[PDB]
Amino acid sequence: GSSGSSGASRPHQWQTDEEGVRTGKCSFPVKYLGHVEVDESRGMHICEDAVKRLKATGKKAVKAVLWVSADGLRVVDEKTKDLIVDQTIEKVSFCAPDRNFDRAFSYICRDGTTRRWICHCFMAVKDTGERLSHAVGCAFAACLERKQKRSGPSSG
């Protein structure tokens, strides 16, 4: 009894990510662009500026599954399902969608090596940043929830 995993089709599209974030199965096929530096650390236009950055950095993406959890995220390596990166919702300061590419999602977070702010980007595989913005925004709301307060019952 640890957590385990198991991917499979689902009815919902976004809501499904709202559960996998609480239950433990909110992962989808995406690509890892990388992490870029920021200045403001907050700006829906920033995230975008990030992608572009990596788009000008002349690099490549990695084929991995982006996991989303209240604890944050987890860039698993489809290779052996290993762990490529481990991001925590905490650090994640902001996360905004995109509106230029086909599926380019990014989010700001406080670096955990130096002493600055870093932004991450992920090129969805067969999805759109929006959805990714939901999952990321799902965990956040969840994590936040614990801190924040909830009005009226909302089980589902």
Q: Where exactly are the structural domains of the chain?
A: 12-149
Give 78's DSSP letter.
Answer: T
Amino acid at 105: F
Establish how many alpha carbons lie within 13 A of residue 66's alpha carbon, considering only the half-sphere containing its beta carbon: 33
Token code pair at residue 26: 């909110």
Closest CA to 46 of 102, 96, 114: 96
> Residue 58 belongs to what H/E stretch?
none
Give 88's DSSP letter.
Answer: E
Closest CA to 120 of 139, 102, 101, 93: 93
DSSP, collapsed to helix, strand or coil, labels residue 80 as coil
Tell me the pairing of strands 104-110 and 82-88: unpaired
Scanning 41-103, the segments in alpha helix (DSSP H) are 44-57
Tell me how many degrees the CA angle 143-67-112 measures, rounded to the nearest 5: 65
* Sequence-ordered list of residues with C-beta below 8 angstroms from that of 38, at least 6 positions apart, any chain: 46, 50, 108, 117, 118, 119
CA–CA distance from 146 to each of 22, 33, 47, 141 (Å)?
12, 31, 26, 9
Residue at token pair 């690099």: 59
Method: NMR
The secondary structure of 95-136 as a DSSP string is EE--SSSSSEEEEEEE-SSSSSEEEEEEEESSS-HHHHHHHH
Q: Counting every residue, how long is the chain?
A: 156
Report the top-level CATH class of 12-149. Answer: mainly beta
